[PDB]
Write a protein that binds this ligand. Structure first.
Ligand SMILES: [Cl-]
Ligand SMILES: [Cl-]
Ligand SMILES: [Cl-]
Ligand code: NA
Length: 576
């Protein structure tokens, strides 16, 4: 009517007589401080908002497209970026809106359901691609994923969700949605009710648009506050790595990993025949039937649920900041819960004309411990390329390296992993006999304990410092920080080691993502201390080097007294 359909030409529904269209003249500045003016039609709320968040907006469609709007983008350095989608899955859903909030201007809202001329998005694509303009985003992985899948290029991101998560230091598992973050840092309550509104129509009501404008311009004010808190916490280095790691993570999720259905259904029939063999031949046997039962039901039966029927690809979900240590986690499916047996990981293959390159660190955790504790014997041994287990064997047995046998090294393995991570000699005994099948005595493990820390004086001093301080706040070599709810000696030792691994892998993915562009390399997976890339077979030897140096250079960034070792192989399946 005169009210509801008043702005139907702009594809807007006036739901409550609370929207006016206005036309004013806006000043436009460039790099040379020159001011040129333009007249723009924008929308505003009749009832003013009880805050200072920019709530006006331009809407861009085919009927009103004013090219001069792109002049707002001239010589800017940051902008709030948000999108509205019709759902959560980038493959099944569409981008309904794109919002860009430039400081001191009403938000520019691209009505994507009512745009069909490519010229309208030109100035948009430039802002996104411009590596010298910061795009402030909330949930950058989610938004970047949609933009990438819709053939939008983007670079330079500051994720307010990553900053808030890092500042929380794993003290809370909830409170990181836009609504929470804005209420905390700005004391403004956004109309979160609009998330459940209908975005699939070619028309939107005024309330949906005021929300799409305010949920994008608020990013400008969150960036200033969060940027300052990051700096005060000395979290810039980690926050920067995490922000740059968004794109490699999107790359992994968008590429997925191809599944060989032949071996899948085959192995399903095989383990199934072994299970039926158990039932028939029975009704050793228990452990066998149970193993095959979990293998079949918990894996062979669940996995097909995630296979893209049209591409035989799995598109897992990588969580950037949901583990205690900062390591990646995955879900739907959880890649680290997939069995390690070569019988099962052989099912994952590269695309045609491509091949996998798989790389691992050998002993990154133990080398990190040596650097953190600054233990002279360990650092010198690593630098002379002496094996750490052989080393400890020579200390325990007092033998020289030529007289050290395999049983000596096996015992030393248990001592190293047990004592480096904070066990006492009693726990060492149980740990050794349980996981290594050694049957050592308390008097022996007591000798191991005293001998270990008598020679590894750096570790002994570091461990004693941790016990005495009983501190709750710990940091990694990237200065990623955590605060414990209560003091645990073994967790205090483990966090800087595991958290530094996270830093190294995440920085390796960032360098790798840049180094692979020349050969259109694809980042596939990151689990534990390994990364998998997929490349055309002709760039095989070139990608082998890129992956190794991306991981070596990352470790070199954090470790100054010890050199990492990368084991790398070229494979046609994940089971190799
Ligand atoms: Cl600090
Ligand atoms: Cl930063
Ligand atoms: Cl290593
Ligand atoms: Na967002």
């Amino acid at each position: 009517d005169e009210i509801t359909k008043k702005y139907i030409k702009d594809n807007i529904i006036n739901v409550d007589d609370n929207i006016i269209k206005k036309k004013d003249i806006f000043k436009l500045k460039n790099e040379n401080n020159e001011i040129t003016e333009c007249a723009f039609e924008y929308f505003e709320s009749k009832k003013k908002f009880d805050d200072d968040i920019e709530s006006r907006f331009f809407i861009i469609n085919d009927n009103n497209y004013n090219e001069n709007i792109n002049l707002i983008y001239k010589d800017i350095k940051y902008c709030g970026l948000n999108i509205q989608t019709t759902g959560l899955e980038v493959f099944d859903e569409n981008i309904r809106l794109i919002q860009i909030a430039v400081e001191n201007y009403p938000v520019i809202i691209y009505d994507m359901f009512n745009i069909n001329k490519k010229d309208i998005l030109d100035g948009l694509r430039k802002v996104l691609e411009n590596k010298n303009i910061i795009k402030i985003i909330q949930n950058g992985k989610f938004d970047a994923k949609f933009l990438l899948h819709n053939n939008f290029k983007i670079e330079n991101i500051f994720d307010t969700y990553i900053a808030s998560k890092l500042l929380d230091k794993n003290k809370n598992m909830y409170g990181f949605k836009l609504n929470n973050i804005v209420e905390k840092y700005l004391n403004v309550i956004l109309d979160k009710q609009q998330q459940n509104s209908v975005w699939n129509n070619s028309l939107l009501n005024n309330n949906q648009l005021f929300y799409a404008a305010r949920d994008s311009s608020c990013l400008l004010k969150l960036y200033k506050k969060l940027k300052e808190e990051i700096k005060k916490e000395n979290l810039h280095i980690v926050n920067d790595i995490e922000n740059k790691c968004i794109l490699p993570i999107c790359d992994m999720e968008l590429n997925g990993i191809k599944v060989d259905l032949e071996n899948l259904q085959k192995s399903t029939n095989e383990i199934l025949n072994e299970l039926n063999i158990e039932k028939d031949n029975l009704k050793i046997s228990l452990r066998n039937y149970r193993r095959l039962y979990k293998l079949y039901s918990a894996f062979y039966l669940k996995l097909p649920l995630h296979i893209n029927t049209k591409t035989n690809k799995i598109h897992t979900t990588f969580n950037q900041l949901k583990t205690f240590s900062g390591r990646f986690s995955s879900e739907k499916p959880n890649l680290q819960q997939i069995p390690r047996q070569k019988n099962i990981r052989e099912i994952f293959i590269p695309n045609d004309n491509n091949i996998f390159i798989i790389a691992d660190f050998k002993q990154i955790e133990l080398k990190i411990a040596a650097e953190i504790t600054n233990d002279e014997i360990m650092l010198k041994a690593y630098n002379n390329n002496i094996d750490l287990h052989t080393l400890t064997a020579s200390i325990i047995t007092k033998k020289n390296i030529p007289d050290i046998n395999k049983e000596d090294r096996h015992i030393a393995k248990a001592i190293n992993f047990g004592l480096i991570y904070g066990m006492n000699y009693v726990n060492l005994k149980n740990y050794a006999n349980t996981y290594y099948g050694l049957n050592m005595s308390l008097d022996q493990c007591l000798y191991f304990y005293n001998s270990f820390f008598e020679h590894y004086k750096g570790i002994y001093k570091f461990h004693n410092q941790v016990k005495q301080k009983r501190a709750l706040q710990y940091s990694t070599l990237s200065n990623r920080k955590v605060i414990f709810p209560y003091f645990s000696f073994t967790k205090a030792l483990n966090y800087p080691v595991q958290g530094t691994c996270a830093d190294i892998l995440k920085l390796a993915l960032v360098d790798l993502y840049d180094n692979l562009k020349d050969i259109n390399g694809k980042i596939i997976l990151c689990v534990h201390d390994e990364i998998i890339i997929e490349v055309n077979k002709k760039f095989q030897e070139e990608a082998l080097k890129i992956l190794v140096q991306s991981m070596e250079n990352s470790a070199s960034y954090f470790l100054k007294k010890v050199k990492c070792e990368v084991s790398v192989k070229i494979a046609e399946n994940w089971g190799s």
